[PDB]
Amino acid sequence: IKQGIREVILCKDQDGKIGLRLKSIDNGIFVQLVQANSPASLVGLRFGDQVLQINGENCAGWSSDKAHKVLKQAFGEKITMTIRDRPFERTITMHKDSTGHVGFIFKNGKITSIVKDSSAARNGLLTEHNICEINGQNVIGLKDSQIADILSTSGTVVTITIMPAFIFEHIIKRMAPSIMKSLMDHTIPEV
């Protein structure tokens, strides 16, 4: 979680698209979906990112409709955005043991129990928290089995990014689980 605010410059692709859906939460604007191979993934936009400004206008109190409308009517040759990095999220670092465990159970991306004298226990992993990323890779709406797979095929150091269930469930609301699985950027970022 980068310790505040950064500017991004976007250029609409050939189809006039940036690869972004937005959601009104608590009178802010938050990233609900970043589409793979889009302008929004290139410049590094993330699920849970807050959009403070679009072309130097404040997003405070905008509807999801209005945020999308503004993006539609932008001479998209160039779009500035002011971003606060995933303000609703936290990052926890764990170390696998002998039997290759970090020591929780999760269902539908949501951590449901922590396991006795584990790295998850030692590091204060919380339950009722949705898994948003694993080693910087967005994992939102992958099956649980594929989440297990990123963890097995990960280094002995494991860096998980979590969001409280209540807030998770308010962001992804009115977004079909198919699009989550299908279209959300799940790639390692490019250099």
Side-chain angles (χ1 to χ4, degrees), residues 16 34 39 58 61 71 77 82 102 112 117 119 123 126 129 136 182 190:
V34 180
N58 296 330
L71 282 179
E77 315 300 50
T82 304
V102 302
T112 47
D117 280 292
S119 179
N123 281 273
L126 294 192
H129 274 75
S182 290
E190 155 196 357

Side-chain angles (χ1 to χ4, degrees), residues 13-189:
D13 75 5
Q14 285 201 284
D15 304 333
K17 286 179 187 164
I18 34 186
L20 206 56
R21 296 282 280 169
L22 295 188
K23 186 65 127 91
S24 156
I25 308 286
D26 293 345
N27 287 282
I29 295 294
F30 290 93
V31 178
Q32 176 193 65
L33 224 166
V34 180
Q35 176 164 42
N37 314 311
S38 71
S41 32
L42 270 177
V43 303
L45 282 192
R46 275 197 291 309
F47 178 90
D49 270 356
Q50 189 184 355
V51 182
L52 296 206
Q53 287 109 29
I54 306 208
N55 286 331
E57 293 203 80
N58 296 330
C59 310
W62 286 7
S63 69
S64 324
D65 288 332
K66 190 202 186 152
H68 294 137
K69 194 171 208 190
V70 162
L71 282 179
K72 210 165 151 141
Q73 311 174 192
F75 311 66
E77 315 300 50
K78 174 178 170 176
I79 317 194
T80 67
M81 289 177 74
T82 304
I83 308 302
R84 187 175 308 279
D85 189 57
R86 296 154 291 166
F88 295 126
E89 291 155 79
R90 280 189 293 132
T91 288
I92 310 266
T93 289
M94 287 147 298
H95 300 270
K96 298 179 208 186
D97 60 14
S98 57
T99 84
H101 289 109
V102 302
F104 64 95
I105 305 176
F106 71 97
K107 198 174 98 187
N108 312 115
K110 194 174 89 166
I111 299 149
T112 47
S113 71
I114 321 301
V115 174
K116 171 140 228 175
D117 280 292
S118 86
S119 179
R122 284 185 302 271
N123 281 273
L125 202 51
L126 294 192
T127 53
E128 203 49 17
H129 274 75
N130 273 265
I131 306 174
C132 293
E133 313 175 350
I134 301 174
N135 301 317
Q137 189 152 257
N138 167 324
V139 302
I140 295 189
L142 299 186
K143 294 164 179 171
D144 290 319
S145 43
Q146 337 192 224
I147 287 165
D149 285 357
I150 301 171
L151 280 162
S152 266
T153 71
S154 163
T156 72
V157 173
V158 199
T159 294
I160 303 183
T161 298
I162 70 178
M163 184 182 307
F166 189 61
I167 303 185
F168 195 75
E169 292 297 330
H170 182 193
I171 284 167
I172 65 135
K173 186 207 314 209
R174 312 283 196 266
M175 162 182 70
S178 84
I179 305 151
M180 265 211 301
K181 202 163 92 79
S182 290
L183 288 150
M184 179 87 64
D185 181 30
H186 298 132
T187 42
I188 309 228

